[PDB]
């Protein structure tokens, strides 16, 4: 259907037996009472489109995902800057994605790198994706930066932002943002269940970045990750969270200081 719905011409009824406005809500179903079984309507040929409300047009937005700092000092230097790939770091795309239970999609990661004061000097960077199980690079001159049997992107700061496409690589058939279980067997404590809700089917490796040079470069870069979902399929729709987020991998909320879903009114017998 390319349009929403057309309206049939209706009229009045004067007869017993037909009750379309007495739909019982105790059955768990939604009231199917239309306008034609009610106040007299007319013939309207609606041609309003429904294409924008689809899932592929709703999840085709990039949004901010990760912010990675790279100081590259001279005396307190590290060289590299890894970033665990997770979507729960910023509450916008998290709120947009946690309204479903199971999802399956592809990615269009984009990397925007700027300096501290803001300046595009021609410094070439190396963006490395470390899959889960591969060793992480330790140092700006490590052995792992050879990128043999490992995908990496070489780009400068004066160049346009890099953009790669990422397939679906979870060992399960779909992702999940809510895991009602435990990752392994054993006795689970009563004090602090810090492993509850953890899903090993979402650890998508680690993302590292360094500056390709010989000695050093006294510059503090700041990379931003923009992930565009595509080819997305969602299952089991879940309600939208009404409480402020507190942690990344845990949906914890405030016991006291609760936020009501609707703001307060003057009286119940007042519309304004």
């Amino acid at each position: 259907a390319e349009s929403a719905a057309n309206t049939t011409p209706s009229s009045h009824r004067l007869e017993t037996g037909r009750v379309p406005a007495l739909q019982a809500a105790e059955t768990g179903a939604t009231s199917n009472a239309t306008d034609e079984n009610m106040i007299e309507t007319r013939c309207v040929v609606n041609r309003n489109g429904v294409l924008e409300t689809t899932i592929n047009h709703f999840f085709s937005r990039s949004g901010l995902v990760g912010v990675v700092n790279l100081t590259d000092g001279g005396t307190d230097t590290t060289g590299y800057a890894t970033w665990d790939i997770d979507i729960m770091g910023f509450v916008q795309l998290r709120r947009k994605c946690e309204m479903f239970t199971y999802m399956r999609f592809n990615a269009e990661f984009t990397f925007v790198t700027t300096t501290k004061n803001g300046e595009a000097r021609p410094y070439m960077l190396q963006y490395m994706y470390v899959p889960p199980g591969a060793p992480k690079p330790t140092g700006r001159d490590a052995f792992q930066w050879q990128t043999a049997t490992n995908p990496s992107v070489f780009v400068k700061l004066t160049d346009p932002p890099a953009q790669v496409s990422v397939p679906f690589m979870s060992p399960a058939s779909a992702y999940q943002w809510f895991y009602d279980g435990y990752p392994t067997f054993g006795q689970h404590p009563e004090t602090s269940n810090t492993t509850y809700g953890l899903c090993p089917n979402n650890m998508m490796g680690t993302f590292a970045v360094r500056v390709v040079s010989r000695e050093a470069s006294q510059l503090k870069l700041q990379t931003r990750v923009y992930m565009k979902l595509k080819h997305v399929r969602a299952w089991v729709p879940r309600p939208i969270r009404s409480q402020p987020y507190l942690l990344k991998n845990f949906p914890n909320y405030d016991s006291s200081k609760i936020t009501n879903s609707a703001r307060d009114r003057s009286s119940i017998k007042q519309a304004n």
Binding site: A5, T34, N48, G49, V91, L246, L247
Partner: protein
Amino acid sequence: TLWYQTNYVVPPETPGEAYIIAMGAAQDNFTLKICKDTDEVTQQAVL
């Protein structure tokens, strides 16, 4: 606006205070257009 048509009559030995649950949905001619950001979240604590 929900008005009282006749009354809420109640027999003896019966509580005289009830409640009404209001539900809401959309019909088949419901249409949406022009995607934007919500205004239910403006700031966020560093996670």
